[PDB]
Amino acid sequence: LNQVLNDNIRNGHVINQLMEALMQLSRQQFPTMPVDYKRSIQRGILLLS
Amino acid sequence: SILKKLEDIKPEQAKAQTKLFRIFEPRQKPIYIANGEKERRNRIYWKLKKDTLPDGDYDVREYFLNLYDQVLTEMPDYLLLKDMAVENKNSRDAGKVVDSETASICDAIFQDEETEGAVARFIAEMRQRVQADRNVVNYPSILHPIDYAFNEYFLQHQLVEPLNNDIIFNYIPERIRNDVNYILNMDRNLPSTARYIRPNLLQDRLNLHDNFESLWDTITTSNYILARSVVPDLKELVSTEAQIQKMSQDLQLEFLTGINSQAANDCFKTLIAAMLSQRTMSLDFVTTNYMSLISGMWLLTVVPNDMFIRESLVACQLAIVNTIIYVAFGMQRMHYRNGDPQTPFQIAEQQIQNFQVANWLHFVNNNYFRQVVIDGVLNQVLNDNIRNGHVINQLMEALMQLSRQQFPTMPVDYKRSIQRGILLLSNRLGQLVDLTRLLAYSYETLMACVTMNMQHVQTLTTEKLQLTSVTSLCMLIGNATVIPSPQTLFHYYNVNVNFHSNYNERINDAVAIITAANRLNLYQKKMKAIVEDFLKRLHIFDVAVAPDDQMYRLRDRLRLLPVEVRRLDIFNLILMAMDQIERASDKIAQGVIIAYRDMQLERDEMYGYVNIARNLDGFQQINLEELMRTGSYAQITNMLLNNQPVALVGALPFVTDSSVISLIAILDATVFAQIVKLRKVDTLKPILYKINSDSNDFYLVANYDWVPISTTKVYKQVPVQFDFRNSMHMLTSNLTFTVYSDLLAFVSADTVEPINAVAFDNMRIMNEL
Amino acid sequence: LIGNATVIPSPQTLFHYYNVNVNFHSNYNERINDAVAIITAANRLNLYQ
């Protein structure tokens, strides 16, 4: 008996989905948030993307 | 600091090919008859000039990539043919040849007692024919067909172009010649035969304005430094002490800190440079300094919103509104939360009732740049209401309304101080109008001298600028106009075009190398080295900072762009003839064939009795590259153990044995045991049989007249025979032409009279007479 | 900070881990067998203390 991961993550494909979602969040409006905090958040998101 | 780094760029050097790029050279070799004896007359064949190719097909492809890189790096831009000429001593028509080695070959062939007379007479008949009426000359040359094709391709795609005075007259960007305030002059002619090099004027293809903010910010910082270096200084400033005492008298005190000429000059240069290079700036000011607030309000009136960080813009707007605007009409002060998509000025526009102030706020809200494409260069242009400076009046009227309301819910002294500040700013209306018109004209004229696409995207590093300098500039400007010096403008333009050409050239080189590497099925090369070379050669970065991840992302971005035509055709030519170059080498073979059946050997006029298999049909093909890559040995071991035919294709070093003892005593198949025993095929050394009269063991094949029979053959192709009548060619070139670089030094410009300067609308720039 | 360095477990390390795990499993099974045999034999032979 063994516990194994799903095939989709095994070949390294979910990272593309994560990158696309992060890039979608990058150009988002991000309303009702201060300037520097939002800028830092989206630039860190871009860094990880 | 970085000024030297960004100003020490010289145009990319055009190599002058001292000799034709050679891979093949003639070599004299002995021959044998079909029986196997010396002919006592040698023949000359083709051999590689360089024999540094290592074994292993992957290393072969690596060597090919290096060869392509060397060829492209040693590309000839302009190819002279009169310089490379040595007089032949044997041409009875006193001709001249292309290369010194060509002369040596001609002398060798002309003097060899074993050679006939027809070839000698053909050698003696060589002579260059010059036709100067159409500027074309012909030269003789001897090359392998690959070399001749490469030389022809280099010859027929030179980058020169005929030069005339009107061409340089049109080489200047249009938005300089078209204006009247600048006049061009020459002092020398140009011949009809001179040539020059056009730089590259193609826009960005890496999209460095998007999702690459690090290098983009670095480039923006460099260009901002350059612009600060180039923007002209101010002349004829009013005396500081007199202005200070006059303002003090005007204010009736019983503030003014930060008013010096250096501050005004730094503010002017920094503002113009930041506007030019799209480097965003951040502000800073004490909230309890009303005059600073009004000066910043003027600054926001002229410069649009998009060039300011949201933090600084929000702070400045909040201070302005809640210190003057709602204070005027006595309405409840607004609490603008830091982070709403709306701006304080937008809310103020939606709130107040009076006409002029609302109109001015509405103007400052939505005043955005316009993207305009001129002469193939994208640029940012202010609204036409800003260049003629009429909008300033639409400012002042609103400010004038601010002096009429009673200012309820405020003490008298606060109203008095605000009225003093607004009056001091108002009395200098003409100075502000002249300064704004001067700024508009200077920005337009200078910005019309850039040749790279620009985008309005905020970057990471932000410029620091205090408003006290702006107040000093607004209070200290005088009457003398300032026009950028033509010499400085031309120097800036030369530096900018040099930078752009360097960038484009490096881009094309990297694209060509990567395309060739990925088309030659290379997959065991860490590709960060090429990107590091590119970044270093751009001569603005240090590879010690940018990590590898961005290099790989840049590579993936770069793969998409189609490569330039010349390099694509060069790669096509170098790949189409890959097999002939690879096989003709006399250091590596192309595989080993094993059959375990009695087969006869071939007879060639360059090796005598040699064991060679011209084709590989009728056997199972196994790749040595895969054999080493995957480490498997299953199929090959089972095929060899059961003694069945096998064929191997791949690079292998060879050992030459020329003993008939080795021929009779089978030893050409005993070099396969190590494959099973050692289970590694890196050093597989097949034995190459060879029988001839030189080895003093050929009497065996002569006395008993037996046909040699072996069990192995080596995948090697006999080199092609050399014929002098075919390698001869008549290369085509140009007679003589002086290559010109640094062309703009031949044009000089004179400043117009500073008073009579005309900016854009048939009117004088400054008018405070 | 992840670079472009491929790192697979070394074959000798893999065999070391496999041998250690199987040795531990064998010891666990044999000790379980001895304990259950001892208790069962003691219970069948009427050794209640």
Fill in the DSSP letter of residue B745: G
Q: Which residues of A touch B311 (CB under 8 A)?
A: 35-36
Query: Tokens for B600?
Result: 């006869």
Residues 6+ apart with CB under 8 A from B97: B85, B86, B87, B88, B103, B106, B126, B139, B140, B141
Q: Which helix (H) or strand (E) holds B729?
A: strand B728-733
CA distance B74 to B71: 5
Q: Which residues of C touch B548 (CB under 8 A)?
A: 3-4
Query: Could you tell me if A19 lies within 8 Å of chain B, comparing CB atoms?
Result: no
Distance from CA of B421 to the nearest CA of C (A): 56
Torsions phi, psi of B381, nearest 5? -125, 135
Distance from CA of C11 to the nearest CA of B (A): 14
Residues 6+ apart with CB under 8 A from B348: B321, B325, B326, B334, B361
- B41-51: buried (b, 16+ CB within 10 Å) or exposed (e) per residue? eeebbbbbeee
Alpha helices by DSSP H, B74-158: 100-110, 117-124, 145-155
Distance from CA of C4 to the nearest CA of B (A): 9
Residues 6+ apart with CB under 8 A from B489: B176, B230, B445, B446, B449
Torsions phi, psi of B299, nearest 5? -60, -40
Task: State the amino acid at position B303 in one-letter form.
Answer: V
| C vs B contact (3+ beta-carbon pairs below 8 A) | yes
Query: Could you tell me if C10 lies within 8 Å of chain B, comparing CB atoms?
Result: no
Q: Which residues of B touch A41 (CB under 8 A)?
A: none
Identify the residue among B210, B280, B310 best suited for mutation to test binding to A, counting A beta carbons within 10 A and taking the highest: B310
Query: Could you tell me if B524 lies within 8 Å of chain C, comparing CB atoms?
Result: no
Query: Could you tell me if A41 lies within 8 Å of chain B, comparing CB atoms?
Result: no
Beta-carbon separation of B552 and C3 below 8 A: no
Query: Could you tell me if C3 lies within 8 Å of chain B, comparing CB atoms?
Result: yes
Q: Which residues of C touch B528 (CB under 8 A)?
A: 4
Query: Tokens for B576?
Result: 């189409």
Q: Are strands B136-142 and B728-733 parallel, antiparallel or unpaired?
A: antiparallel
Distance from CA of B527 to the nearest CA of C (A): 11
Beta bridge partners of B24: B48
Beta-carbon separation of B341 and A31 below 8 A: yes
| Model resolution, angstroms | 4.7
Task: Report the neighbours of A using a cutoff of 3 or more CB pairs below 8 angstroms.
Answer: B
CA distances C26 to A1, B35, B96, C29, C35, Å, are 18, 76, 91, 5, 14
CA distance B688 to B610: 8
Beta-carbon separation of C3 and B548 below 8 A: yes
Which chain A residue has the Cα nearest residue B310? A35
Q: Are strands B195-197 and B739-740 parallel, antiparallel or unpaired?
A: parallel
Q: Are B217 and B460 in contact (CB under 8 A)?
A: yes
Residue B502 CB-half CA count within 13 A: 21
Alpha helices by DSSP H, B338-411: 344-351, 355-366, 384-387, 391-402
Q: Which helix (H) or strand (E) holds B215?
A: helix B213-230
CA distance B588 to B324: 87
Beta-carbon separation of B528 and C3 below 8 A: no
Query: Could you tell me if B205 lies within 8 Å of chain C, comparing CB atoms?
Result: no
CA distance B479 to B566: 56
Query: Could you tell me if C4 lies within 8 Å of chain B, comparing CB atoms?
Result: yes
Torsions phi, psi of B25, nearest 5? -140, 145
Supply the angle between the helices B429-447 and B391-402 in degrees, to the nearest 10.
150
Task: State the amino acid at position B403 in one-letter form.
Answer: S
Beta bridge partners of B733: B137
Q: Are B296 and B315 in contact (CB under 8 A)?
A: no
CA distance B521 to B621: 19
Q: Which residues of B touch A31 (CB under 8 A)?
A: 340-341
Query: Could you tell me if B553 lies within 8 Å of chain A, comparing CB atoms?
Result: no
Query: Tokens for B524?
Result: 């065991």
Distance from CA of A1 to the nearest CA of B (A): 31
Beta-carbon separation of B314 and A35 below 8 A: yes
Query: Could you tell me if B174 lies within 8 Å of chain C, comparing CB atoms?
Result: no
| A vs C contact (3+ beta-carbon pairs below 8 A) | no
Place of tokens 């009004």: B294
Q: Which of B211, B339, B460 sits opposite A32 (nearest CB)?
A: B339
CA distance B655 to C44: 81
CA distance B694 to B609: 12
Q: Which of B22, B34, B3, B64 is nearest to B577 (CA)?
A: B64
- B442-468: buried (b, 16+ CB within 10 Å) or exposed (e) per residue? bbbbbbbbbbbebeeebbeebbebbbb
Residues 6+ apart with CB under 8 A from B304: B367, B368, B369, B382
Q: Are strands B463-466 and B130-131 parallel, antiparallel or unpaired?
A: unpaired
Q: Which residues of B touch C4 (CB under 8 A)?
A: 526, 528, 548, 552
Torsions phi, psi of B373, nearest 5? -95, 115
Beta bridge partners of B426: none
Q: How far apart are the first and last CA of chain B?
A: 42
The structure was resolved experimentally with: cryo-EM
Which chain B residue has the Cα nearest residue C5? B526
Query: Tokens for B328?
Result: 């005027």
Q: Which of B9, B96, B24 is nearest to B580 (CA)?
A: B24
Beta-carbon separation of A46 and B460 below 8 A: no
As a three-state string, the secondary structure of A5-45 is: CCHHHHCCCHHHHHHHHHHHHHCCCCCCCCHHHHHHHHHHH
Torsions phi, psi of B140, nearest 5? -90, 150
Q: Which helix (H) or strand (E) holds B466?
A: strand B463-466
Which chain C residue has the Cα nearest residue B550? C3
Q: How far apart are the first and last CA of chain C?
A: 64
Q: Which residues of A touch B340 (CB under 8 A)?
A: 31-32
Task: State the amino acid at position B465 in one-letter form.
Answer: L
Q: Strands, E, within B98-245: which ranges?
A: 130-131, 136-142, 160-162, 182-186, 195-197
CA distances B329 to B325, B360, B403, B425, Å, are 7, 16, 11, 21
Identify the residue among A29, A35, A40, A42 best suited for mutation to test binding to B, counting B beta carbons within 10 A and taking the highest: A35
Query: Could you tell me if B548 lies within 8 Å of chain C, comparing CB atoms?
Result: yes
Query: Could you tell me if A43 lies within 8 Å of chain B, comparing CB atoms?
Result: yes
Q: Are B631 and B666 in contact (CB under 8 A)?
A: no
- B263-282: buried (b, 16+ CB within 10 Å) or exposed (e) per residue? bbbbbbbbbbbbbbbbbbbe
CA distance B716 to B585: 9
Place of tokens 């108002």: B426
